[PDB]
Symmetry: none
Subunit: 80 residues, 2 copies
Amino acid sequence: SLTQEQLEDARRLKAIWEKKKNELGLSYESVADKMGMGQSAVAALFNGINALNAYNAALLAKILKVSVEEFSPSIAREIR
Amino acid sequence: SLTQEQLEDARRLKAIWEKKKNELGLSYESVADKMGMGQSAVAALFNGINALNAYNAALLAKILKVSVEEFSPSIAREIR
């Protein structure tokens, strides 16, 4: 089970994805491919089924062209 | 024109960027946004085209999770 804060991280992440995927030219398929992971594995992060870690948070921040803190202030402090 | 020390600051900064950008989840775009500037201006600082100042050096050090002196000993003194 995810903590409340991990569910809030995922909600912020999914909202950034939904806001930016068109301008980034990305799809449900192509962002998983960019992350070298399965489609449902990435959806799992966005939808709050699996929690983020520092590896995944960093890779998604780079792909989405945002700061980690915009979806996970806690991972962003600790990656720090 | 940059002095040799200013060019070394940039060089040392670029080396830290190359070392830490992936693990920290950094992109030119996310850095540019934090720095209130464009992506080419960020690159110009890394590439020794424009010189660092105290504000940009402090913010880049925070972003890269390093002390300023790791790339600019002279500007670190100015901040002190």
